[PDB]
Design an enzyme around this catalytic site. Structure first.
Site, PDB file in Angstrom:
ATOM      1  N   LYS B  37     -15.845  29.241 -33.434  1.00 37.85           N
ATOM      2  CA  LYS B  37     -16.518  29.951 -34.516  1.00 37.85           C
ATOM      3  C   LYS B  37     -17.937  30.366 -34.118  1.00 37.85           C
ATOM      4  O   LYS B  37     -18.301  31.543 -34.232  1.00 37.85           O
ATOM      5  CB  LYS B  37     -16.517  29.080 -35.763  1.00 37.85           C
ATOM      6  CG  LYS B  37     -15.119  28.894 -36.344  1.00 37.85           C
ATOM      7  CD  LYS B  37     -15.114  28.040 -37.609  1.00 37.85           C
ATOM      8  CE  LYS B  37     -16.526  27.718 -38.085  1.00 37.85           C
ATOM      9  NZ  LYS B  37     -16.547  27.007 -39.389  1.00 37.85           N
ATOM     10  N   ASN B  38     -18.746  29.413 -33.634  1.00 33.13           N
ATOM     11  CA  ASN B  38     -20.087  29.733 -33.148  1.00 33.13           C
ATOM     12  C   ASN B  38     -20.049  30.769 -32.031  1.00 33.13           C
ATOM     13  O   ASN B  38     -20.969  31.580 -31.901  1.00 33.13           O
ATOM     14  CB  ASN B  38     -20.784  28.465 -32.650  1.00 33.13           C
ATOM     15  CG  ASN B  38     -21.315  27.608 -33.781  1.00 33.13           C
ATOM     16  OD1 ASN B  38     -20.924  27.786 -34.933  1.00 33.13           O
ATOM     17  ND2 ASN B  38     -22.224  26.680 -33.460  1.00 33.13           N
ATOM     18  N   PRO B  74     -47.797  31.273 -28.972  1.00 33.17           N
ATOM     19  CA  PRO B  74     -46.483  31.585 -29.560  1.00 33.17           C
ATOM     20  C   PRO B  74     -46.264  30.862 -30.908  1.00 33.17           C
ATOM     21  O   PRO B  74     -46.232  29.634 -30.892  1.00 33.17           O
ATOM     22  CB  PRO B  74     -45.486  31.089 -28.485  1.00 33.17           C
ATOM     23  CG  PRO B  74     -46.337  30.743 -27.251  1.00 33.17           C
ATOM     24  CD  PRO B  74     -47.684  30.385 -27.801  1.00 33.17           C
ATOM     25  N   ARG B  84     -24.676  19.931 -26.939  1.00 31.75           N
ATOM     26  CA  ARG B  84     -23.526  19.077 -26.706  1.00 31.75           C
ATOM     27  C   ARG B  84     -23.241  19.120 -25.221  1.00 31.75           C
ATOM     28  O   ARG B  84     -23.438  20.157 -24.590  1.00 31.75           O
ATOM     29  CB  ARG B  84     -22.299  19.531 -27.508  1.00 31.75           C
ATOM     30  CG  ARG B  84     -22.343  19.212 -29.001  1.00 31.75           C
ATOM     31  CD  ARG B  84     -22.234  20.460 -29.844  1.00 31.75           C
ATOM     32  NE  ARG B  84     -22.634  20.218 -31.227  1.00 31.75           N
ATOM     33  CZ  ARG B  84     -23.316  21.071 -31.985  1.00 31.75           C
ATOM     34  NH1 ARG B  84     -23.689  22.263 -31.533  1.00 31.75           N
ATOM     35  NH2 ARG B  84     -23.623  20.726 -33.235  1.00 31.75           N
ATOM     36  N   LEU B  85     -22.854  17.976 -24.659  1.00 29.51           N
ATOM     37  CA  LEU B  85     -22.371  17.906 -23.285  1.00 29.51           C
ATOM     38  C   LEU B  85     -21.502  16.664 -23.200  1.00 29.51           C
ATOM     39  O   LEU B  85     -21.944  15.569 -23.583  1.00 29.51           O
ATOM     40  CB  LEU B  85     -23.512  17.852 -22.268  1.00 29.51           C
ATOM     41  CG  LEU B  85     -23.063  18.020 -20.798  1.00 29.51           C
ATOM     42  CD1 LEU B  85     -24.080  18.745 -19.935  1.00 29.51           C
ATOM     43  CD2 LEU B  85     -22.732  16.703 -20.164  1.00 29.51           C
ATOM     44  N   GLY B  95     -18.449  12.768 -11.155  1.00 32.27           N
ATOM     45  CA  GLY B  95     -19.610  13.617 -10.993  1.00 32.27           C
ATOM     46  C   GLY B  95     -19.606  14.863 -11.855  1.00 32.27           C
ATOM     47  O   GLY B  95     -20.563  15.635 -11.795  1.00 32.27           O
ATOM     48  N   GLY B  97     -20.103  15.102 -14.945  1.00 35.11           N
ATOM     49  CA  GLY B  97     -21.198  15.047 -15.899  1.00 35.11           C
ATOM     50  C   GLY B  97     -22.477  15.611 -15.326  1.00 35.11           C
ATOM     51  O   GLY B  97     -23.089  16.524 -15.900  1.00 35.11           O
ATOM     52  N   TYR B 133     -29.530  11.498 -19.466  1.00 35.20           N
ATOM     53  CA  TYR B 133     -30.517  12.566 -19.491  1.00 35.20           C
ATOM     54  C   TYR B 133     -31.786  12.183 -18.736  1.00 35.20           C
ATOM     55  O   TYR B 133     -32.317  12.979 -17.951  1.00 35.20           O
ATOM     56  CB  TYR B 133     -30.814  12.919 -20.934  1.00 35.20           C
ATOM     57  CG  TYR B 133     -29.721  13.730 -21.531  1.00 35.20           C
ATOM     58  CD1 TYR B 133     -29.214  14.822 -20.856  1.00 35.20           C
ATOM     59  CD2 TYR B 133     -29.218  13.431 -22.768  1.00 35.20           C
ATOM     60  CE1 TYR B 133     -28.231  15.587 -21.389  1.00 35.20           C
ATOM     61  CE2 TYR B 133     -28.237  14.192 -23.320  1.00 35.20           C
ATOM     62  CZ  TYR B 133     -27.743  15.276 -22.630  1.00 35.20           C
ATOM     63  OH  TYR B 133     -26.752  16.048 -23.180  1.00 35.20           O
TER      64      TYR B 133
HETATM   65  C1  LIG Z   1     -26.300  16.225 -26.162  1.00 41.31           C
HETATM   66  C2  LIG Z   1     -25.278  15.141 -25.964  1.00 41.31           C
HETATM   67  O1  LIG Z   1     -24.078  15.290 -26.009  1.00 41.31           O
HETATM   68  S1  LIG Z   1     -26.027  13.623 -25.654  1.00 41.31           S
HETATM   69  C3  LIG Z   1     -24.584  12.562 -25.351  1.00 41.31           C
HETATM   70  C4  LIG Z   1     -24.154  13.115 -24.000  1.00 41.31           C
HETATM   71  N1  LIG Z   1     -22.694  12.941 -23.905  1.00 41.31           N
HETATM   72  C5  LIG Z   1     -22.059  11.843 -24.253  1.00 41.31           C
HETATM   73  O2  LIG Z   1     -22.649  10.819 -24.605  1.00 41.31           O
HETATM   74  C6  LIG Z   1     -20.525  11.891 -24.106  1.00 41.31           C
HETATM   75  C7  LIG Z   1     -19.991  10.571 -23.601  1.00 41.31           C
HETATM   76  N2  LIG Z   1     -20.072  10.472 -22.133  1.00 41.31           N
HETATM   77  C8  LIG Z   1     -19.789  11.491 -21.326  1.00 41.31           C
HETATM   78  O3  LIG Z   1     -19.376  12.588 -21.778  1.00 41.31           O
HETATM   79  C9  LIG Z   1     -19.974  11.243 -19.855  1.00 41.31           C
HETATM   80  O4  LIG Z   1     -20.094   9.831 -19.652  1.00 41.31           O
HETATM   81  C10 LIG Z   1     -21.296  11.716 -19.265  1.00 41.31           C
HETATM   82  C11 LIG Z   1     -21.425  13.233 -19.407  1.00 41.31           C
HETATM   83  C12 LIG Z   1     -22.504  10.996 -19.896  1.00 41.31           C
HETATM   84  C13 LIG Z   1     -21.190  11.305 -17.790  1.00 41.31           C
HETATM   85  O5  LIG Z   1     -20.134  12.068 -17.160  1.00 41.31           O
HETATM   86  P1  LIG Z   1     -19.512  10.939 -16.154  1.00 41.31           P
HETATM   87  O6  LIG Z   1     -18.605  11.615 -15.155  1.00 41.31           O
HETATM   88  O7  LIG Z   1     -19.499   9.661 -17.047  1.00 41.31           O
HETATM   89  O8  LIG Z   1     -20.711  10.827 -15.120  1.00 41.31           O
HETATM   90  P2  LIG Z   1     -20.863  11.282 -13.570  1.00 41.31           P
HETATM   91  O9  LIG Z   1     -19.622  10.713 -12.972  1.00 41.31           O
HETATM   92  O10 LIG Z   1     -21.293  12.734 -13.553  1.00 41.31           O
HETATM   93  O11 LIG Z   1     -22.151  10.453 -13.157  1.00 41.31           O
HETATM   94  C14 LIG Z   1     -23.246  11.120 -12.484  1.00 41.31           C
HETATM   95  C15 LIG Z   1     -24.260  10.028 -12.218  1.00 41.31           C
HETATM   96  O12 LIG Z   1     -24.741   9.559 -13.499  1.00 41.31           O
HETATM   97  C16 LIG Z   1     -24.667   8.151 -13.604  1.00 41.31           C
HETATM   98  N3  LIG Z   1     -24.428   7.894 -15.024  1.00 41.31           N
HETATM   99  C17 LIG Z   1     -23.291   8.309 -15.711  1.00 41.31           C
HETATM  100  N4  LIG Z   1     -23.299   7.986 -17.006  1.00 41.31           N
HETATM  101  C18 LIG Z   1     -24.556   7.384 -17.195  1.00 41.31           C
HETATM  102  C19 LIG Z   1     -25.187   6.873 -18.331  1.00 41.31           C
HETATM  103  N5  LIG Z   1     -24.611   6.867 -19.569  1.00 41.31           N
HETATM  104  N6  LIG Z   1     -26.446   6.356 -18.200  1.00 41.31           N
HETATM  105  C20 LIG Z   1     -27.016   6.365 -16.949  1.00 41.31           C
HETATM  106  N7  LIG Z   1     -26.510   6.848 -15.805  1.00 41.31           N
HETATM  107  C21 LIG Z   1     -25.275   7.367 -15.989  1.00 41.31           C
HETATM  108  C22 LIG Z   1     -23.518   7.771 -12.670  1.00 41.31           C
HETATM  109  O13 LIG Z   1     -23.629   6.502 -12.025  1.00 41.31           O
HETATM  110  C23 LIG Z   1     -23.687   8.791 -11.538  1.00 41.31           C
HETATM  111  O14 LIG Z   1     -24.633   8.267 -10.581  1.00 41.31           O
HETATM  112  P3  LIG Z   1     -24.957   9.033  -9.233  1.00 41.31           P
HETATM  113  O15 LIG Z   1     -26.036  10.156  -9.522  1.00 41.31           O
HETATM  114  O16 LIG Z   1     -25.436   7.997  -8.214  1.00 41.31           O
HETATM  115  O17 LIG Z   1     -23.629   9.769  -8.752  1.00 41.31           O
END
Ligand SMILES: CC(=O)SCCNC(=O)CCNC(=O)[C@H](O)C(C)(C)COP(=O)(O)OP(=O)(O)OC[C@H]1O[C@@H](n2cnc3c(N)ncnc32)[C@H](O)[C@@H]1OP(=O)(O)O
Lengths: 41, 156
Positions: B37-38, B74, B84-85, B95, B97, B133
Protein backbone atom coordinates in the site's frame (compact mmCIF):
# COMPACT_ATOMS: atom_id res chain seq x y z
CA UNK A 1 1.69 4.35 12.76
CA UNK A 2 5.34 5.15 11.76
CA UNK A 3 6.12 8.74 12.78
CA UNK A 4 7.61 10.91 10.03
CA UNK A 5 7.44 14.40 11.58
CA UNK A 6 9.31 14.92 14.84
CA UNK A 7 8.46 18.18 16.66
CA UNK A 8 10.93 18.98 19.43
CA UNK A 9 10.92 21.62 22.13
CA UNK A 10 13.38 24.41 21.48
CA UNK A 11 15.97 23.17 24.00
CA UNK A 12 15.91 19.63 22.60
CA UNK A 13 15.85 20.90 19.01
CA UNK A 14 19.03 22.80 19.72
CA UNK A 15 20.71 19.73 21.22
CA UNK A 16 19.62 17.84 18.11
CA UNK A 17 21.26 20.44 15.87
CA UNK A 18 24.44 20.39 17.96
CA UNK A 19 24.72 16.61 17.87
CA UNK A 20 23.80 16.62 14.18
CA UNK A 21 26.50 19.15 13.40
CA UNK A 22 29.21 17.70 15.65
CA UNK A 23 31.98 15.59 14.10
CA UNK A 24 30.81 12.08 13.33
CA UNK A 25 30.54 9.73 16.29
CA UNK A 26 30.90 5.94 16.36
CA UNK A 27 33.44 6.03 13.55
CA UNK A 28 34.33 2.49 14.63
CA UNK A 29 30.93 1.00 13.82
CA UNK A 30 30.91 3.20 10.76
CA UNK A 31 34.10 1.72 9.27
CA UNK A 32 32.51 -1.66 10.00
CA UNK A 33 29.49 -0.82 7.84
CA UNK A 34 31.65 0.53 5.04
CA UNK A 35 33.65 -2.71 5.17
CA UNK A 36 30.60 -4.91 4.51
CA UNK A 37 30.84 -6.45 1.03
CA UNK A 38 27.56 -8.15 0.08
CA UNK A 39 27.41 -11.11 -2.29
CA UNK A 40 24.06 -10.65 -3.98
CA UNK A 41 22.98 -13.00 -6.76
CA UNK B 1 23.48 -24.58 4.60
CA UNK B 2 24.76 -22.19 1.92
CA UNK B 3 21.83 -19.85 1.24
CA UNK B 4 21.98 -17.45 -1.71
CA UNK B 5 19.86 -14.31 -2.03
CA UNK B 6 19.03 -11.86 -4.80
CA UNK B 7 20.03 -8.21 -4.72
CA UNK B 8 17.64 -5.80 -2.94
CA UNK B 9 14.82 -4.88 -5.28
CA UNK B 10 11.60 -2.93 -4.94
CA UNK B 11 8.72 -4.97 -3.62
CA UNK B 12 6.14 -5.78 -6.30
CA UNK B 13 2.87 -7.70 -6.40
CA UNK B 14 4.65 -10.83 -7.69
CA UNK B 15 6.74 -11.34 -4.53
CA UNK B 16 5.63 -14.02 -2.07
CA UNK B 17 5.12 -12.56 1.40
CA UNK B 18 3.28 -15.15 3.50
CA UNK B 19 6.27 -17.39 4.35
CA UNK B 20 8.23 -14.44 5.81
CA UNK B 21 8.84 -14.64 9.56
CA UNK B 22 11.39 -12.60 11.48
CA UNK B 23 10.15 -13.45 15.00
CA UNK B 24 8.49 -10.03 15.43
CA UNK B 25 4.80 -9.92 14.47
CA UNK B 26 4.62 -6.17 13.85
CA UNK B 27 7.45 -6.36 11.26
CA UNK B 28 6.05 -9.42 9.45
CA UNK B 29 2.53 -7.96 9.52
CA UNK B 30 3.81 -4.65 8.19
CA UNK B 31 5.36 -6.42 5.21
CA UNK B 32 2.08 -8.16 4.42
CA UNK B 33 -0.44 -5.50 5.32
CA UNK B 34 1.11 -2.07 4.70
CA UNK B 35 4.24 -2.40 2.54
CA UNK B 36 2.58 -2.65 -0.88
CA UNK B 37 0.00 0.00 0.00
CA UNK B 38 2.74 2.50 0.96
CA UNK B 39 4.59 1.48 -2.21
CA UNK B 40 1.65 2.42 -4.44
CA UNK B 41 0.96 5.67 -2.53
CA UNK B 42 4.64 6.69 -2.92
CA UNK B 43 4.72 6.97 0.88
CA UNK B 44 7.64 4.54 1.23
CA UNK B 45 10.00 2.46 -0.83
CA UNK B 46 10.30 -1.15 0.40
CA UNK B 47 13.28 -3.20 -0.79
CA UNK B 48 13.29 -7.00 -0.47
CA UNK B 49 15.77 -9.81 -0.89
CA UNK B 50 14.69 -13.22 -2.08
CA UNK B 51 15.98 -16.76 -2.15
CA UNK B 52 17.91 -17.12 -5.38
CA UNK B 53 15.59 -18.13 -8.26
CA UNK B 54 12.40 -17.49 -6.28
CA UNK B 55 10.21 -14.58 -5.29
CA UNK B 56 10.26 -15.90 -1.68
CA UNK B 57 11.26 -12.90 0.45
CA UNK B 58 13.75 -13.64 3.23
CA UNK B 59 14.66 -10.01 4.02
CA UNK B 60 13.41 -6.44 3.58
CA UNK B 61 13.90 -2.83 4.58
CA UNK B 62 11.81 0.30 4.13
CA UNK B 63 12.83 3.90 3.39
CA UNK B 64 10.84 7.10 3.75
CA UNK B 65 11.66 10.80 4.10
CA UNK B 66 11.19 12.54 7.41
CA UNK B 67 11.56 15.87 9.13
CA UNK B 68 12.64 17.18 12.52
CA UNK B 69 11.31 20.64 13.38
CA UNK B 70 10.91 22.77 16.53
CA UNK B 71 8.01 24.16 18.56
CA UNK B 72 7.36 27.16 16.26
CA UNK B 73 6.47 27.43 12.54
CA UNK B 74 16.50 24.46 7.38
CA UNK B 75 13.09 24.94 9.12
CA UNK B 76 12.59 21.16 9.28
CA UNK B 77 15.93 19.34 9.05
CA UNK B 78 15.56 16.64 6.35
CA UNK B 79 16.21 13.01 7.31
CA UNK B 80 15.54 9.60 5.83
CA UNK B 81 13.71 7.14 8.08
CA UNK B 82 14.93 3.57 7.79
CA UNK B 83 11.72 2.41 9.40
CA UNK B 84 11.94 -1.38 9.16
CA UNK B 85 14.73 -3.88 8.57
CA UNK B 86 14.29 -7.60 9.13
CA UNK B 87 15.78 -10.93 8.09
CA UNK B 88 13.80 -14.17 8.06
CA UNK B 89 14.25 -16.38 11.15
CA UNK B 90 15.31 -19.22 8.82
CA UNK B 91 18.18 -17.18 7.36
CA UNK B 92 19.87 -15.62 10.40
CA UNK B 93 23.63 -15.70 10.76
CA UNK B 94 24.53 -15.48 7.08
CA UNK B 95 25.35 -11.75 7.01
CA UNK B 96 22.13 -10.76 5.23
CA UNK B 97 21.37 -8.33 8.05
CA UNK B 98 24.51 -6.32 7.66
CA UNK B 99 24.21 -6.66 3.87
CA UNK B 100 20.72 -5.15 3.90
CA UNK B 101 21.92 -2.34 6.16
CA UNK B 102 24.93 -1.67 3.96
CA UNK B 103 22.67 -1.50 0.89
CA UNK B 104 20.20 0.82 2.63
CA UNK B 105 22.91 3.23 3.78
CA UNK B 106 24.64 3.22 0.40
CA UNK B 107 21.25 3.90 -1.21
CA UNK B 108 20.73 6.86 1.11
CA UNK B 109 24.22 8.28 0.58
CA UNK B 110 23.79 8.41 -3.22
CA UNK B 111 20.28 9.67 -2.61
CA UNK B 112 21.79 12.56 -0.63
CA UNK B 113 23.64 13.73 -3.73
CA UNK B 114 20.25 14.40 -5.33
CA UNK B 115 18.49 16.17 -2.41
CA UNK B 116 19.64 17.45 0.95
CA UNK B 117 19.55 14.69 3.62
CA UNK B 118 21.16 15.28 6.97
CA UNK B 119 20.90 11.79 8.52
CA UNK B 120 19.34 8.31 8.54
CA UNK B 121 17.15 7.64 11.55
CA UNK B 122 16.16 4.22 12.92
CA UNK B 123 13.90 3.14 15.74
CA UNK B 124 15.36 0.24 17.75
CA UNK B 125 12.35 -1.51 19.28
CA UNK B 126 14.52 -3.79 21.41
CA UNK B 127 18.01 -3.96 22.85
CA UNK B 128 19.27 -6.43 20.20
CA UNK B 129 18.09 -4.01 17.52
CA UNK B 130 20.03 -1.26 19.27
CA UNK B 131 23.10 -3.44 19.51
CA UNK B 132 22.97 -4.22 15.78
CA UNK B 133 22.50 -0.60 14.74
CA UNK B 134 25.21 0.63 17.13
CA UNK B 135 27.61 -2.03 15.85
CA UNK B 136 27.36 -0.43 12.41
CA UNK B 137 27.68 3.25 13.16
CA UNK B 138 24.39 4.51 14.56
CA UNK B 139 24.30 6.92 17.54
CA UNK B 140 21.70 7.67 20.22
CA UNK B 141 19.60 10.67 19.25
CA UNK B 142 17.91 13.27 21.44
CA UNK B 143 14.66 13.06 19.44
CA UNK B 144 13.38 9.84 21.06
CA UNK B 145 14.71 7.25 23.52
CA UNK B 146 14.63 4.49 20.88
CA UNK B 147 15.72 6.62 17.94
CA UNK B 148 19.25 6.43 16.58
CA UNK B 149 20.87 8.33 13.72
CA UNK B 150 23.63 7.82 11.15
CA UNK B 151 25.07 11.15 9.97
CA UNK B 152 25.23 11.75 6.24
CA UNK B 153 28.32 13.72 5.28
CA UNK B 154 28.92 16.14 2.40
CA UNK B 155 29.01 14.70 -1.14
CA UNK B 156 31.99 12.30 -1.00
C1 LIG C 1 14.12 -0.51 12.42
C2 LIG C 1 14.08 -1.93 12.93
O1 LIG C 1 13.52 -2.85 12.40
S1 LIG C 1 14.96 -2.08 14.40
C3 LIG C 1 14.83 -3.87 14.71
C4 LIG C 1 15.75 -4.37 13.61
N1 LIG C 1 15.27 -5.70 13.21
C5 LIG C 1 14.90 -6.64 14.06
O2 LIG C 1 15.03 -6.51 15.28
C6 LIG C 1 14.39 -7.95 13.43
C7 LIG C 1 14.87 -9.15 14.21
N2 LIG C 1 16.23 -9.55 13.81
C8 LIG C 1 16.64 -9.56 12.54
O3 LIG C 1 15.85 -9.27 11.60
C9 LIG C 1 18.07 -9.95 12.31
O4 LIG C 1 18.57 -10.55 13.50
C10 LIG C 1 19.05 -8.79 12.15
C11 LIG C 1 18.69 -7.95 10.93
C12 LIG C 1 19.13 -7.92 13.42
C13 LIG C 1 20.40 -9.50 11.95
O5 LIG C 1 20.37 -10.22 10.70
P1 LIG C 1 21.23 -11.55 11.11
O6 LIG C 1 21.61 -12.30 9.85
O7 LIG C 1 20.67 -11.89 12.53
O8 LIG C 1 22.67 -10.90 11.26
P2 LIG C 1 24.02 -11.02 10.38
O9 LIG C 1 24.15 -12.49 10.23
O10 LIG C 1 23.94 -9.99 9.26
O11 LIG C 1 25.08 -10.44 11.41
C14 LIG C 1 26.01 -9.41 10.98
C15 LIG C 1 26.87 -9.13 12.19
O12 LIG C 1 26.02 -8.57 13.21
C16 LIG C 1 26.17 -9.25 14.44
N3 LIG C 1 24.86 -9.15 15.08
C17 LIG C 1 23.69 -9.72 14.56
N4 LIG C 1 22.61 -9.48 15.30
C18 LIG C 1 23.07 -8.64 16.33
C19 LIG C 1 22.42 -8.02 17.40
N5 LIG C 1 21.08 -8.14 17.63
N6 LIG C 1 23.16 -7.24 18.24
C20 LIG C 1 24.51 -7.12 18.00
N7 LIG C 1 25.22 -7.66 17.00
C21 LIG C 1 24.45 -8.40 16.18
C22 LIG C 1 26.60 -10.66 14.04
O13 LIG C 1 27.46 -11.34 14.96
C23 LIG C 1 27.48 -10.38 12.82
O14 LIG C 1 28.82 -10.10 13.27
P3 LIG C 1 30.01 -9.87 12.25
O15 LIG C 1 29.98 -8.37 11.75
O16 LIG C 1 31.31 -10.25 12.96
O17 LIG C 1 29.74 -10.79 10.97
Amino acid sequence: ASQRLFVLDNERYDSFITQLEAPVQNAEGRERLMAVKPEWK
Amino acid sequence: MEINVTAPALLTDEHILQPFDCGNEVLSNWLRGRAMKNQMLNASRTFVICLEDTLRIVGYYSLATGSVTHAELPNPVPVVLLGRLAVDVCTRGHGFGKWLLSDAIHRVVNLADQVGIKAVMVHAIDDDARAFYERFGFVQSVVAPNTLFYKVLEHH
